[PDB]
Structure 1
Amino acid sequence: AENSVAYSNNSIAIPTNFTISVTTEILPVSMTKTSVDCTMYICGDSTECS
């Protein structure tokens, strides 16, 4: 939305009331831990491929 602050060199704007806002912030920390095997993934139950 277009706004225009009414600026002049003798006028100020002071709040007379307030509000208390509780906002939410979501942050990732860790991810899934995985582990791999060579022979079970690549060949798998194969002696000559191992």
Structure 2
Amino acid sequence: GAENSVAYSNNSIAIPTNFTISVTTEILPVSMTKTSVDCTMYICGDSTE
């Protein structure tokens, strides 16, 4: 990060005088594709054996 130092004193304070309304984007997945797998069609083809 940026190497910066904060001026610290026992009788020094910083009171903000202005503000900026910011919007932060967060991406969260909640679901995935629902797949169904059966052995008889996957493991076997068209053979009874």
- Could you tell me the percent identity over the aligned residues? 100
- Larger RCO, structure (CA 8 Å, separation 6 or more): 1
Deviating above 2 A after TM superposition, structure 1's stretches of 4 or more consecutive aligned residues are: none
CA RMSD of aligned residues (A): 0.7
- Length-normalised TM-score, structure 1: 0.89
Gaps of 5+ in 1: none
**Cα deviation code 1:1-50 (max 9, x no counterpart):** 101100000110110100100111110000110001111100111011xx
Question: How many positions carry a matched residue from both structures?
Answer: 48
Please identify which structure carries the higher strand content. 2
